Design a binder for this molecule. Structure first.
Ligand SMILES: Nc1ncnc2c1ncn2[C@@H]1O[C@H](COP(=O)(O)OP(=O)(O)O)[C@@H](O)[C@H]1O
Ligand SMILES: [Mg+2]
Ligand SMILES: [Mg+2]
Lengths: 20, 336
């Protein structure tokens, strides 16, 4: 399922900004 | 509304032109614990000696700020924060600097980030999501009326207060701008296509970001995700969105109008501005005045045990605050 795919990805924690 | 916003813009302008500086000093606070870390600095829970009140103190290492070329951004953050005043906006109490750091002392929001609750619980019911969404809508209506763009909406930057209401924090990428801007900044999952395509953008990006937030809250995961930011940009640019089975028809309709790649059709950026969103079916049961006044029944109220309780925040590696004997970057941060 999409949820299972999300939980297995490397981006489930606090996400940091991207900058110039 | 136009009656109220008009008065707000006046107080904002006075403070925007003549900002306050050096309203406190380090030795008036007792550092307690870290509440959160960020790409830029750390935020600690502190206790003000004379009053006994708790505050969240954001610490910025000047040298680190310079390395990452965030000088102008840091100056915007401080100048904007000390000028705004809205119910759902974190409040700056004091601000100061010493040889090595820049400090911003805000009101402490003990309810924790929306992020933690969202990930613990899985997802919020539509009525639950709508409650938060409404607050962001009014908040963006205020900010945009002052020519400001937020640019960093996400659950990590939203705090839940003692009454169960939202408090937006982190004005790191906030900017006052009439016309368009070009900085590539924000969080990958929340970036609007205009940004990634480097074409110059406006307020419209905040509305797209609202779409991502609502989607994340209701689904429990963002509309576009992958393991590497580059793979994420590809998804955002294609504009292909898929909704969970449990998503109501009204919610899907709103979302399609906020997650609109064509900024000439995106809700929030049309003739009726913010009204296309307020009048939309999904918000029909929403009493706008009630929420602004905080008279609504909050769906979820975090449990806090007295002042100073940090149980709603994760634990972080404590790091000693260092103050050099020599002044660092004095000219660059003069106005701060
Ligand atoms: N006023 C506040 N009250 C309580 N916690 C806060 C407050 N401001 C920030 N925090 C915590 O600090 C974290 C980082 O603050 P933020 O300004 O977003 O830092 P950065 O810009 O480096 O990301 C937040 O995500 C949150 O957990
Ligand atoms: Mg942040
Ligand atoms: Mg930031």
């Amino acid at each position: 399922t999409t949820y299972a795919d999300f939980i297995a990805s490397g981006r489930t924690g606090r996400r940091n900004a991207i900058h110039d | 509304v136009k009656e109220f916003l008009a008065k707000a813009k006046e107080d904002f302008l006075k403070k925007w032109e003549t900002p306050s500086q050096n309203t406190a000093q380090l030795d008036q606070f007792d550092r307690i614990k870290t509440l959160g870390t960020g790409s830029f600095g750390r935020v600690m829970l502190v206790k003000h000696k004379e009053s006994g009140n708790h505050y969240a103190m954001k610490i910025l290492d000047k040298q680190k700020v310079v390395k990452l070329k965030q000088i102008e951004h840091t100056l915007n953050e401080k100048r904007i924060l000390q000028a705004v005043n809205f119910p759902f906006l974190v409040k700056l109490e004091f601000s100061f600097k010493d040889n090595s750091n820049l400090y911003m002392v805000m009101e402490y929001v003990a309810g924790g980030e929306m992020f933690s609750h969202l990930r613990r619980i899985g997802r919020f019911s539509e009525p639950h999501a709508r409650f938060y969404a409404a607050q962001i809508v009014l908040t963006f209506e205020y900010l945009h009326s002052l020519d400001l763009i937020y640019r960093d909406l996400k659950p990590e930057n939203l705090l839940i207060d003692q009454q169960g209401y939202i408090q937006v924090t982190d004005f790191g990428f906030a900017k006052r701008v009439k016309g368009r801007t070009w900085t590539l900044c924000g969080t990958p999952e929340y970036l609007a296509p205009e940004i990634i395509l480097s074409k110059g953008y406006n307020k419209a990006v905040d509305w797209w970001a609202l779409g991502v937030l609502i989607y994340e809250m209701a689904a429990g995961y963002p509309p576009f995700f992958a393991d590497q930011p580059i793979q994420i940009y590809e998804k955002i640019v294609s504009g292909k969105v898929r909704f969970p089975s449990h998503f109501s028809s009204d919610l899907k309709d709103l979302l399609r109008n906020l997650l609109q790649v064509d900024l000439t059709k995106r809700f929030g950026n049309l003739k009726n501005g913010v009204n296309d969103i307020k009048n939309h079916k999904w918000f029909a049961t929403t009493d706008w005045i009630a929420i602004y006044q905080r008279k609504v029944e909050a769906p979820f109220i975090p449990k806090f045990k007295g002042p100073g309780d940090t149980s709603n925040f994760d634990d972080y590696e404590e790091e000693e605050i260092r103050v050099s004997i020599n002044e660092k970057c004095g000219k660059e941060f003069t106005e701060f």
